[PDB]
Paper text:
Tau amyloid fibrils have previously been established to adopt many distinct conformations across different neurodegenerative conditions. High-resolution structures revealed paired helical filament (PHF) and straight filament (SF) conformations of tau that were identical to those determined from AD cases. The PHFs and SFs are made of two C-shaped protofilaments, each containing a cross-β/β-helix motif. Overall, these results establish that, despite substantial differences in genetic background and age, tau filaments that arise in individuals with DS and neurodegeneration are identical to those in AD.
To overcome the low level of tau filaments obtained from the 36-year-old case, we used a custom-developed graphene oxide (GO) affinity-grid method in which the cryo-EM sample grids were derivatized with anti-tau antibodies to capture and enrich for tau filaments prior to vitrification. For this procedure, single-layer GO was applied to QUANTIFOIL grids, functionalized with a PEG maleimide, and coupled to protein G for binding to the AT8 phospho-tau (S202 and T205) antibody. This GO-AT8 affinity-grid method was tested initially for capturing tau filaments purified from case 2 samples, which exhibited robust NFTs. Conversely, when AT8 was included in the grid preparation, we observed extensive tau filaments in cryo-EM images, although some background contaminants remained. Together, these data indicate our GO-AT8 affinity-grid method successfully enriched for tau filaments in an AT8-dependent manner. Next, cryo-EM datasets were collected for tau filaments isolated from DS cases 2 to 4, with GO-AT8 affinity grids being used for cases 2 and 4. The resulting cryo-EM reconstructions showed all cases contained predominantly AD PHF conformations, while cases 2 and 3 also exhibited substantial SFs, similar to case 1. However, molecular models for cases 2 and 4 confirmed PHF and SF conformations were resolved using the GO-AT8 grids. Notably, structure determination for case 4 remained limited by the low abundance of isolated filaments, resulting in a final resolution of 5 Å for the case 4 PHF. Nonetheless, our structure determined to 5.0-Å resolution was sufficient to establish the AD PHF fold.
Residue numbers in the entry:
A (entry chain G), B (entry chain E), C (entry chain C), D (entry chain H), E (entry chain F), F (entry chain D): 304 to 380
Write the structure that this text describes.
């Protein structure tokens, strides 16, 4: 018997952006209040967690564009 | 018997951005209040965690563009 | 029997940015208040953790562009 | 002619209070936001004024009792 | 002619208070935000004023009792 | 003609307080933010004023009791 495999995807695409001025942006939060209460935690495996935050962000990229791409190949008898 | 594999993906893409001035950006939080209470923690394996934060960010990149790409190949009898 | 493998991905892509002035950026937080309370911690394996923060950031790169890329190959009888 | 006046009010009253413990009192405001806008002010005579406040109070007297009392007398030809 | 005046008010009153423990009192404001805008001010006579405050108080007297009392007398031909 | 005046008010009153322990009192403000803007001020006569405050107080007297009392007398032809 015989087996042959060719895996040759060709990627030629683009992700692009154009802009003038981003200009006046304001973020003026009047601070709230947070309370959290707990007895025991057991984050045993691959947990991602966040507790009692009160958290502010101003993410303002000039681009902010993104590409994600994944390839796989598997073989058995 | 025989086996042959060729793994030759060709990547030619782009991620790009263009901008004028990013200019006036403001972030003026009036500070809140956070309280968190707990008895025991047991973060046994690969945990990522954050507790009682009260946290402010102004992330302003001129680009901020991103690409992610992953390849794999596996073999058995 | 025989086995042959060729692993030759060709990467030719780009991640790029262009900008004028980034200019006026302000971050003027009115400081909040944080309290956190706990009895025991047991961060046994590969934990990443942060408690009672009250933390401010102004990350302003001229670029900020990123690429991530990973390759693998595996073999057995 | 003749005139005679006697002004002799007799005040014997009381204002009084009795209490146990005043105990658990909480005041935990999540801070709001106030904006006020104006062009000209002309507070010419005996004005009492307050603008753009955002103001918190916890007045907790053990007594807090009050008395007010006023007397007058007037004469003419 | 003749005129006679007697002004002899007799004040014998009391203002009083009694208390146990005043105990647990909390005041934990999550700080708000205030903005005020104006062009001209002209507080010409006996003005009392307050602008753009953001102000916190915990007045906790053991007494806090008050008395106010005023007397007057006037005469003419 | 003749005029006679007697002004003899007799004041015998009291203002009083009694207390146990004043005990646990807390004041933990999460700091707000204040902005005030103006062009001209003209506080010409007997003005009392306060601008752009952001101000915290914990007034805790053991007494705090008060008395105010005023007397007057006037005469003419």
């Amino acid at each position: 018997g015989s087996v042959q495999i060719v895996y040759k995807p060709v990627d030629l695409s683009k992700v692009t952006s154009k802009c003038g001025s981003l200009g006046n942006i304001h973020h003026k939060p009047g601070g709230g209040q947070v309370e959290v209460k707990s007895e025991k935690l057991d984050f045993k495996d691959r947990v991602q967690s966040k507790i009692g935050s009160l958290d502010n962000i101003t993410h303002v990229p000039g681009g902010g564009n993104k590409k994600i791409e994944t390839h796989k190949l598997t073989f058995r008898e």
